[PDB]
Amino acid sequence: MAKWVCKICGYIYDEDAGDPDNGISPGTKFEELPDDWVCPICGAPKSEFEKLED
Ligand SMILES: [Fe+3]
């Protein structure tokens, strides 16, 4: 699945991994993350992520 980078801190949201410690099971697409999910490292909103693809 896809990877998305936090443009602030460099954390990668990997859809295959999810973010279980913050309520997100593996295989959750970025677009399916709750509106108030934030970068687990720096707190940036979803607006500050970019999909890693061309
Ligand atoms: Fe971040």
Domain count, the chain: 1
Total Cβ atoms within 10 A of residue 42: 13
Annotated binding-site positions: 6, 9, 39, 42
Residue pair 30/4 in contact (Cβ under 8 Å)? The answer is yes
What is the SS3 assignment for the chain? CCEEEECCCCCEEECCCCEHHHCECCCCCHHHCCCCCECCCCCCEHHHEEECCC
Range of the domain at 24: 1-54
Structure determined via: X-ray
30 Cβ partners below 8 Å, 6+ apart?
2, 4, 13, 15, 46, 49, 51
| Residue 52 belongs to domain with CATH number | 2.20.28.10
Determine the distance separating the centroid of ligand 1 and the alpha carbon of 21, expressed in angstroms: 16
Determine the distance separating the centroid of ligand 1 and the alpha carbon of 49, expressed in angstroms: 8
Which of 54, 3, 51 has its CA nearest to residue 19?
3
How many angstroms is the resolution?
A: 1.0
CA 13-29-27 angle, to 5 degrees, is: 85
Annotated binding-site positions for Fe cation: 6, 9, 39, 42
Cα–Cα dist 15/45, whole Å:
17
